[PDB]
């Protein structure tokens with residue numbers, strides 16, 4: 001699956017119907033992917049990952065900063081699987097930040113599960129695989145919460161995708177605009193005024 | 201507020217994108233309202249409820265059996281609020297069933313919790329009865345409200361989702377007692393509507 | 399057997415947890431934290447599917463005190479049914495000591511009585527004798543709490559916690575209909591007994 | 597501030613057979629020491645205490661990698677709930693560090709900084725880190741640690757928020773590790789002799 005496909009004409013949800021931090025009132029336009037939906041999709045993602053990988057030991061690789069929330073949850077759903085079955089893939093965790101250079105011999109001969117928040121141009125993820133592959137892992141797969149439909153796309157496809165979204169600017173669930181909106185659990189769309197108020 | 205509106209054309213979601221009980225694979229057509237959406241909407245609902253009804257003892261009245269999942273979830277969210285706020289209000293629970301011990305309601309704020317409202321015959325019958333016991337207040341929260349030409353014109357005080365005239369199951373809503381054990385709201389397929397057919 | 403909570407188990411200071419402010423002067427200690435309750439229920443859910451996860455389950459909810467343990471255990475069982483290699487169709491019904499009605503729907507099915515607390519056992523004798531009237535294929539009993547109390551037959555099939563002969567409240571367990579709206583199981587204080595006394 | 601849940605030296609824990617446990621850690625653990633849910637209920641409260649102290653200005657939450665990641669996520673999740681269930685709410689931004697230091701901490705400046713750590717033992721690590729953070733001129737620094745060890749090696753450093761105060765026992769789970777093992781565990785637990793001899797560095 002290309003994930004849950006969200007279409008260009010997806011209206012999303014009025015912010016008045018949800019519980020949203022008062023400080024981001026005028027800063028968002030719509031709720032775009034309810035936190036809940038992100039959980040439900042993630043649950044299925046974790047099963048899909050377990051079907052494909054466990055399998056063997058896994059080194060779960062979290063791409064900070066925007067990846068931390070998906071990573072956390074996904075792992076929790078995996079852990080939930082590891083403790084209600086015979087199928088118990090043991091798993092160590094690791095962290096990288098990519099500002100495009102890194103901030104790893106552990107990966108050598110390992111099954112690595114890269115966990116990212118969003119692929120847009122796919123440039124970041126190409127930089128990541130090449131860096132990682134230099135450490136000769138056994139296998140490498142990518143999980144991305146979001147994959148943008150974009151002309152800018154070189155066309156790297158993640159192994160695991162939560163949602164396929166338009167090229168709107170979305171925030172929340174650890175996806176930031178200039179370090180803001182991470183403290184929000186739904187994925188939402190900035191307002192013009194939000195883009196302006198928090199411009200760097 | 202009419203709540204989250206779901207249009208007559210919303211396709212719901214492909215079942216393969218979600219975790220679904222294996223015994224219901226062929227019986228459902230789509231995931232209609234994802235569990236997590238129910239939660240997010242319920243969370244707000246609880247805050248909305250707590251605005252109108254706090255400040256006096258609330259009796260939460262679950263309408264069996266379909267109302268039990270909403271009731272439990274809604275009330276966990278309410279309690280989540282009540283234990284993280286300067287002052288809070290006592291709350292008692294009670295249960296009712298309508299087939300086709302209430303002086304405990306007098307003077308209190310009654311909050312009837314229901315799964316779906318359709319013609320609204322059901323709820324108007326309950327309200328008729330409840331009101332005889334002189335509650336201070338009565339509000340109804342229903343997860344679902346069906347747009348239907350058969351509606352007598354009852355509207356709840358609290359709505360989660362407004363949905364089309366389609367037959368839905370899950371999140372405690374049944375078809376011939378089935379699909380109660382399923383946390384998504386979903387449309388039941390024909391190849392399963394006849395399978396559980398009475 | 400269950401989680402054996404010791405007679406001299408101190409519990410936890412209320413000021414270390416989040417407690418609804420209206421019950422602040424009414425509780426002595428937190429006895430069984432909400433989350434310990436959840437974790438052990440998760441485990442029970444796996445046991446229930448281990449013993450009965452190979453046929454139709456009818457889960458019976460004993461109102462009122464049972465509604466939370468029921469919601470939660472069924473939620474954990476529900477998580478098993480879509481994530482694991484074993485999937486058991488499940489229907490629910492609710493009884494209060496009637497109740498529903500109809501109960502013929504039990505015949506030839508696996509039946510799981512879900513109860514808050516087994517003290518004397520008289521409540522459970524009654525439900526076990528009831529359910530056996532409709533010739534089920536198997537009756538099993540899950541009870542969250544079992545008191546180590548003198549009272550004189552059946553041994554619960556699935557037990558969350560086994561506790562001293564202390565009066566406890568919360569997690570839908572009550573004292574005079576109060577404390578049902580508390581997520582933790584706590585020991586009532588002597589001032590709490592006095593304020594909500596009948 | 598308060599020492600959090602004081603768990604005694606002779607605390608027995610809970611038998612493993614009573615909980616849901618990863619099959620691959622079955623024999624490597626002795627007891628469940630702090631059930632995941634107990635961590636949760638304690639964390640819910642710690643969140644409110646944090647907000648009562650720090651909620652007056654922009655909070656930057658600083659996660660101490662790697663064993664702090666679980667605590668951090670849950671604590672923030674609670675803090676977020678408080679923030680979106682109130683008309684009053686301050687914005688919150690996040691950052692990370694692993695300890696030399698790994699991982700622009702300038703986002704700390706002028707802000708209310710909440711450091712989130714898994715465990716304080718000798719206390720050297722926290723003092724070392726505060727040495728760094730303090731010279732990014734935050735408005736205020738506060739440390740929350742899920743666990744604090746009662747050890748005679750305690751250099752004297754004490755945090756501001758404590759989940760639990762534990763005995764001098766090697767504990768794993770909830771991201772806390774033993775040679776990178778046991779991070780993928782819900783509960784905080786005590787390693788058996790087999791698991792300990794298994795993974796020793």
Ligand SMILES: O=c1[nH]cnc2c1ncn2CCN(CCOCP(=O)(O)O)CCP(=O)(O)O
Pocket residue numbers: 064065066067098117118119120121122123124125148168169170171174175176177
């Ligand atoms: O809608 C969006 N919201 C927030 N950020 C967005 C969005 N679209 C692209 N980006 C930037 C994502 N970029 C990630 C940069 O890292 C910032 P992080 O530490 O907050 O995760 C690169 C994606 P790609 O073009 O495939 O290499």
Ligand SMILES: O=c1[nH]cnc2c1ncn2CCN(CCOCP(=O)(O)O)CCP(=O)(O)O
Pocket residue numbers: 263264265266267315316317318319320321322323346366367368369373374375
């Ligand atoms: O789409 C549906 N799914 C499931 N059940 C549906 C649906 N529509 C009406 N119902 C039945 C609801 N009717 C009552 C059934 O509820 C009893 P239950 O909770 O034991 O299943 C009456 C609604 P109204 O017309 O407003 O008085």
Ligand SMILES: O=c1[nH]cnc2c1ncn2CCN(CCOCP(=O)(O)O)CCP(=O)(O)O
Pocket residue numbers: 461462463464514515516517518519520521522564565566567571572573
């Ligand atoms: O600590 C306690 N808290 C609350 N209730 C307690 C307690 N101990 C016994 N009980 C009485 C519970 N009984 C059920 C409660 O009464 C009706 P309710 O569940 O609707 O509140 C059953 C116990 P038994 O038949 O002797 O095995």
Ligand SMILES: O=c1[nH]cnc2c1ncn2CCN(CCOCP(=O)(O)O)CCP(=O)(O)O
Pocket residue numbers: 660661662663664714715716717718719720721722745765766767768772773774
């Ligand atoms: O019981 C334990 N379980 C796991 N780890 C333990 C334990 N006790 C000390 N440690 C080592 C913790 N050290 C910090 C953690 O190591 C880096 P990590 O948390 O990213 O794996 C020392 C803290 P301090 O002595 O106050 O400078």
Ligand SMILES: [Mg+2]
Pocket residue numbers: 064065066067116117118
């Ligand atoms: Mg990113």
Ligand SMILES: [Mg+2]
Pocket residue numbers: 176177178179
């Ligand atoms: Mg960025």
Ligand SMILES: [Mg+2]
Pocket residue numbers: 263264265266267314315316
């Ligand atoms: Mg109904």
Ligand SMILES: [Mg+2]
Pocket residue numbers: 374
């Ligand atoms: Mg019906």
Ligand SMILES: [Mg+2]
Pocket residue numbers: 460463464513514515521
């Ligand atoms: Mg009972």
Ligand SMILES: [Mg+2]
Pocket residue numbers: 572573574575
């Ligand atoms: Mg009673």
Ligand SMILES: [Mg+2]
Pocket residue numbers: 660661662663664713714715
């Ligand atoms: Mg550490």
Ligand SMILES: [Mg+2]
Pocket residue numbers: 663773774775776
């Ligand atoms: Mg370590």
